[PDB]
Amino acid sequence: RSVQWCAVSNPEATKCFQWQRNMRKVRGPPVSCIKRDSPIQCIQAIAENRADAVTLDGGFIYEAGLAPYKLRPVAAEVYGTERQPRTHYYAVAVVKKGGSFQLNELQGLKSCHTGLRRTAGWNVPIGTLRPFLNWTGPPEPIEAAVARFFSASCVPGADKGQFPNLCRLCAGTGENKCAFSSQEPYFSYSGAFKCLRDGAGDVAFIRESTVFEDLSDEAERDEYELLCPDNTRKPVDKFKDCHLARVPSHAVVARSVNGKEDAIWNLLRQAQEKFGKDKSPKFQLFGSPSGQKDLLFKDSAIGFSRVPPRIDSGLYLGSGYFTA
Ligand SMILES: [Fe+3]
Numbered sequence: 001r002s003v004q005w006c007a008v009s010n011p012e013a014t015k016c017f018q019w020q021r022n023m024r025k026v027r028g029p030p031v032s033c034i035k036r037d038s039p040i041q042c043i044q045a046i047a048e049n050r051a052d053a054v055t056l057d058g059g060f061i062y063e064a065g066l067a068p069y070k071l072r073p074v075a076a077e078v079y080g081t082e083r084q085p086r087t088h089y090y091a092v093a094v095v096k097k098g099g100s101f102q103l104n105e106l107q108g109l110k111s112c113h114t115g116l117r118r119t120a121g122w123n124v125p126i127g128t129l130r131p132f133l134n135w136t137g138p139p140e141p142i143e144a145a146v147a148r149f150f151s152a153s154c155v156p157g158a159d160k161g162q163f164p165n166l167c168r169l170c171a172g173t174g175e176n177k178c179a180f181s182s183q184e185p186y187f188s189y190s191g192a193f194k195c196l197r198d199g200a201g202d203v204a205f206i207r208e209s210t211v212f213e214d215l216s217d218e219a220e221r222d223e224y225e226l227l228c229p230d231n232t233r234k235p236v237d238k239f240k241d242c243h244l245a246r247v248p249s250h251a252v253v254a255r256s257v258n259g260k261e262d263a264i265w266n267l268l269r270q271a272q273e274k275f276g277k278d279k280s281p282k283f284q285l286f287g288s289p290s291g292q293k294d295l296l297f298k299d300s301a302i303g304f305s306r307v308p309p310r311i312d313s314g315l316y317l318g319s320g321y322f323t324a
Pocket of ligand 1: 120
């Protein structure tokens with residue numbers, strides 16, 4: 001048999017093939033590759049059996065856990081260090097040092113988000129900012145409220161059609177502008193951070209580690225700072241004390257009925273021992289070629305953690321809390 005993996009892009013498919021070929025050479029548990037174009041296509045594919053697994057950000061574990069998919073998280077990615085490992089991360093608001101505006105004075109500013117309906121880039125900041133959005137609930141789409149709040153933004157995935165302001169700072173070329181893919185350079189964590197660094201925006205909504213990952217030199221990282229919820233600004237290393245929310249890690253999702261939770265688990269368990277962190281000069285399960293990022297799994301992940309059975313998206317996600 002084979003656990004069929006779901007890729008949301010060619011480079012992700014490319015890496016999937018290499019993964020398959022290395023599991024073979026090593027005589028390990030088999031993996032196969034399906035190529036889709038988005039988290040949704042993969043969510044359906046799995047639901048309808050053309051695939052078994054895909055790693056998802058919390059806002060998508062949310063959407064999958066719903067009918068008609070009823071998908072369930074199976075393994076969580078692990079962050080941190082081997083020494084201090086964790087299966088959650090911090091949604092922060094990163095800004096340029098020098099400014100004076102606080103979390104509560106963002107009206108009319110320009111923003112950079114990881115992507116529409118993602119945790120750190122959308123769901124968390126938007127729920128936080130809500131008391132200032134003056135949003136006249138349904139039927140009125142939140143994006144409509146958001147577009148009138150920030151002057152211009154980069155929200156990979158937003159409907160440029162009805163919300164051009166949300167795609168305004170985006171850097172993609174042509175039809176790719178504001179695409180929820182890597183064809184849009186300001187997509188995801190690293191791209192949301194680049195949008196801040198390029199000075200397209202004033203605030204980037206990302207996770208804690210991005211600045212450390214994207215900036216090796218400690219000097220440069222001193223140019224940045226974070227917006228805390230008590231309306232203060234703190235240095236970058238202070239995320240523990242200054243964050244908008246604490247969130248469960250991205251997780252591998254599978255069917256709730258005949259998902260193959262066990263095959264998936266053994267494949268991940270062995271791939272991690274064989275090609276995990278610092279294990280093989282030939283293949284890195286957590287590592288992307290230059291130009292790409294977070295292909296299949298997060299690049300800085302150190303491993304996986306199995307999620308106990310029958311545990312639904314609901315309880316998985318219920319782990320998190322909005323800055324209290
Ligand atoms: Fe995330």
